[PDB]
Symmetry: none
Subunit: 204 residues, 8 copies
């Protein structure tokens, strides 16, 4: 235990920032991230569905409401998939060095390591979940799209133009947002462990 932690697992550490920020980061980035967007389009929607609910609803923001609740449910499918792909190589790397063979050594060694990673892998995934729930609270609709234009004349005018834009564009959002996310987030949590975390626990 003294020999194994002290020397062997320090050359292992420095390999991680490096390659990732110049699979490792070189082609983690190109392949995965830029083929991800396709995934997006399929299990998501825009256009004329959006129009129906809003117009009935008034008879501007309040009308919009019904849409987003069911739409966000559909955003789980694509977003999650990208996440998992990163996880495979990176999460398994940490344990990928921690066995060093000796049956005396393995028994103590395992119990300390496995449980730490267990709790912490959940963090990153959860942050993705957060983004989806977000929608329900405000739902502004006056978008980068262009503005509209007894006492009917002022009221309904404003409804029509606004809502329509949002459905397409929100979909645009997620496709880039997941990939970006991962680099900052996914990355740091686990990174620590294998680099440094590992040697630390067994002692302490």
């Amino acid at each position: 235990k003294t020999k194994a932690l002290l020397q062997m697992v320090q050359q292992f550490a420095v390999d991680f920032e490096k390659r990732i920020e110049g699979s490792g980061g070189a082609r983690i980035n190109r392949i995965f991230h830029e083929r991800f967007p396709f995934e997006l389009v399929k299990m998501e929607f825009d256009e004329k569905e959006l129009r129906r609910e809003i117009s009935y609803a008034i008879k501007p923001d309040m009308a919009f409401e019904t849409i987003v609740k069911k739409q966000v449910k559909k955003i789980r499918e694509p977003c999650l998939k990208c996440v998992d792909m990163v996880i495979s190589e990176l999460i398994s790397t940490v344990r990928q060095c921690t066995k060093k063979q000796y049956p005396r050594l393995r028994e103590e060694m395992e119990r300390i390591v496995t449980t730490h990673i267990r709790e912490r892998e959940g963090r990153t995934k959860e942050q993705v979940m957060l983004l989806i729930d977000i929608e329900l609270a405000y739902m502004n609709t006056n978008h980068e799209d262009f503005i509209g234009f007894p006492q009917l004349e002022r009221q309904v005018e404003t409804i029509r133009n606004l809502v329509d834009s949002y459905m397409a564009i929100v979909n645009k959002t997620v496709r880039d947002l997941m990939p970006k996310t991962i680099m900052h987030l996914m990355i740091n949590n686990t990174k620590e462990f294998i680099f440094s975390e590992l040697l630390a626990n067994l002692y302490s």
Copy 2:
């Protein structure tokens, strides 16, 4: 007094739609409403103010987030003005044919009834405040945000466009929401009390 309620507050019943919504009060009022909107446009804002927020946030999803908060502050000014104009004709409407004579009755009738009208004229004004606060509690990043794409090239590319949309949105809202308000609130609300609980209350 039992007879007094039965007939005096019977003709008043039809008097209330009539006078308020029909120069007299009828179309003095309506005129007011269709001159209101012009006030809104001028005294509100767009463009470069919003942009400031970016600088703290970035140091991608987190960076976009900040935007929404800062818009609210200026929107108090316009909204109030409309409210006051309505008040004049309506409060004085009730008293104009609530006399039906008395040293006893006409007066005593007033003393309980006024107190409702105080609390209920307040409603409408309050709705203006509500709208402004509501905005702050969101900061979505699935908003307008569009798809991605020393390291100057990545920094300015997205940020520049971002600001434009969100600024617009508050302007549309106000013009429609203020007018609607009055119909529901001013007119009906206050009517209820004096119409019904009055008979009982006065003995108490």
Copy 3:
């Protein structure tokens, strides 16, 4: 009784101005009112009947007389029918909420309500009747039509041109007049009741 009147029948109230003045008012107006005129034509008359009586009568206003007495009798048929159509949905609405089920509650509840509506539904209908009787008192005949042109020469000249116009045009009148009437009149009386009237009586 305290629970039922106080809360339950206040959300019921505000529904009435609203929809009617933007069946409810949306398609009460289009359908009923603009198919009504047809009704008119049938059971009413114009043209050459009018000519006969006037010319004999002198041997200008006095001559006209005989016509209108029997003509007004015929105006009852069409006018009434429009009236009733509005009544059906609106008069029955008020009682349409006043039962809330409890046999203890129903007995008191019914006796107070039914009799009020009874007396007041008659008002509106009566106003229609008034319009018809009106004719007999003056009967001017020099209409928008064009003027005419021993001591015979001045007298009879004037008779011919005038009378003829009126028969057609008076029929034109009624077809628009009934529909218009209803909105102002019908409307307000009952409106009050269900909105406010109802809660009031039981207490008082």
Copy 4:
């Protein structure tokens, strides 16, 4: 005196059609009548005066109603003029052959008889007044009123046309009614008394 009535008031009998209706009185009179009408046209009114009434009334059936009243005021002027011209020849007609001599008879005969003529010359003038007052007591809305069809579009559409017709009407009336009057009244009425009750009366 018994003989005196029997023959003196026998030749007078035929004298009365004769002289009045046949220069003498015969065609001095007739001429007068056919120069009368021209007076009427000038000194009466149409067009825009009527229009004023609308403004109070509207705030649809009620709005039309007001019209009729305001016309009457100017119609006094012309009508009177005709009357006077007739008077001259007719009153002096009776006396021209009522003498048949006397210190007793011719004179005494006058004293009772004149008093009828006073009251009865008045008739004709009075009929002019009557016609004017009669008008005010109507205000029908089935009049000329034509079929219907911020809210500017509904306001001016109907109102504009409305005024034109009613203004005309008074003008026709006057020209025919004045001439007729004289025949019935002036001439015959006064004759009656002196012809018959005279014989008895004088003893009294």
Copy 5:
């Protein structure tokens, strides 16, 4: 004569009562004639009274305007005899004649100044008799040289009247063609129905002359021809010798002249009376149509008024109706003779 006096006077009174123009202008008789023709002698004989100044040569030497006026006092007063009233008509004559001779002399002198005398009596008709000074062709005594013209105009105011019986007396011993006397009479009645020419001194003509043409009534014919008279000579008159003596000579001339014998049956003063009367009646006849019509008109006037009288209140009319009836009857009677 019986038609002229009675009928006229009777009519005249009725006309007075109605207050109308009575008229019925009674004949004025005047004698005109040459100097010494005998005018006063002729006039007084025919009238039947002695009251005209008479004298020698020229006789009427001053106008005598006499007016007979019916009046109750019965007297007479001269303009020159003031303060005396004569009741004796013979005394009247004596005064007139004496006064004339005394004041002018007996040498033909004349005077245009009238002698005014008015005889008031109830037994007379309202008449005017006028004796006028004799016309001359030649001056005598104290007469002017243009005496011929002055006298002529004076007399003409009376003699022109339609009802004036002119006895134009002319001396044959003076130029008949230059006689004023005959001219006047021929002027008023050319036909000679009521003019009878009196020629004097025909037997007293100068030897060697005669009036054959005039006297034979062919030069200027008259219906009744001529009647001659021979008045008092110069010697006789002076003594107050009376009228009678002159008359005797008168016949002699007409008888013996071969050229004038033929008209003897239309000679004398007596013959003159007979014819004259017939003409007088005629005069009334010509005036009658006019007078009658005036009376008729007044009656008719009120007739229509009567028609309107009867019946009603409307009186002199009634009284008037009766008065008219009387007047009409008199007019008719003259027409029916």
Copy 6:
């Protein structure tokens, strides 16, 4: 007369209670007339009381403004008789007449200065009687030369009133065409329904004149024509000879003149009474429509107020409603006779 007194007074009290314009302007009777026309004699006869100064020649020589005023004290006080209150009306007359004669003399003198006397009594109607000085055309005594105009203006303030019965008295022995008296009366009532012309001294006219045109009622016709009167002569008046004696002469003139016999049935003082009464009633009739309308208006006014009275909180109104009812009834009664 029975329509005028009772009905008017009764109406007047009701109007007082409402605090409105009572009106019902009762006839003022005033006598105007030429100098010596007899104005005081005529006036006191018709009214029925002896209280007017009377005297010779010109009679009314000072204005007497008398006001009858209903009041509880019952007395009388003269402006010139201060400190004395008469209770004997006969004593009133004696004082008035004596004082006038003593101060002006008996030579026609006049004075514009009124004699103020006010008779307070509960047994009278609120009336104004005015005797006025007689108009002249010619000065006498100590009257000014333009007296004609001064007197005329003075009287006109009273006589122009629509309810003034003018007895225009004018002497026939003075120029009628230049008479001020007749002009005034003809001005106010040209038709002659209520003006009856009083012409005096018609039998006292100068020989050789007559009033034929005026008297025959064709120059300026009146409905009721004329009535003559003959008042006291100069000699009689001086002695305090009473009114009675003058009257006798009055009839004589009208009877005997052929041109005026025809109007005899419209002659006398007695006849004047009968006609006059009928006109008086008529006056009320013309004013009635106006008065009635005023009363009606007030009633209607509060009627709509009654409509708003009923229901709610909003009181003189109630009391007023009843008061009006009374007033209306009286007006109707005069119309229905």
Copy 7:
């Protein structure tokens, strides 16, 4: 909605075959400038949108006394019938000018001369 104007203008170049130069009734609002044969509007010779209307000073025109200006459709040559341009004429320059301010309000701006 608001009436900006209403005023007569003379179409100075009206054909031989149409009576000659007559005055025709213009009605200007914030939305249209329409002209009829007269003010009763029984006709409708044309109804021109105020949208895309521009105004130019038409250089004298014919050899007349009129000072002409024209309204022209951005989309086409002729305005109505066989007319080349719709010639509107005033006797004074100023008269043309006052109408320019009324067009201004409705969104007919100058230039494109």
Copy 8:
């Protein structure tokens, strides 16, 4: 990378067939001087490398009031379309001069006049 400039210049010799003399939007950096039809950059009329750009005072030019200078490609005659040279104009000499310093930084040096 660093923006040296950005400023308008008037192409004074723009054809009849292209609106006439208009101002066009120049963007200068250390690497390129590009000009578009306007500042939105929907167009790209050209994108000129800053490499081998040199600057000369073009001797008056046309008979105008402009003081002209030109940017010219070492490799070819015409700069774009049928233009002869790309004429850039300023009303003052000084205005031309301030731009010379901005080119200096990017490697556009003077001479070759």
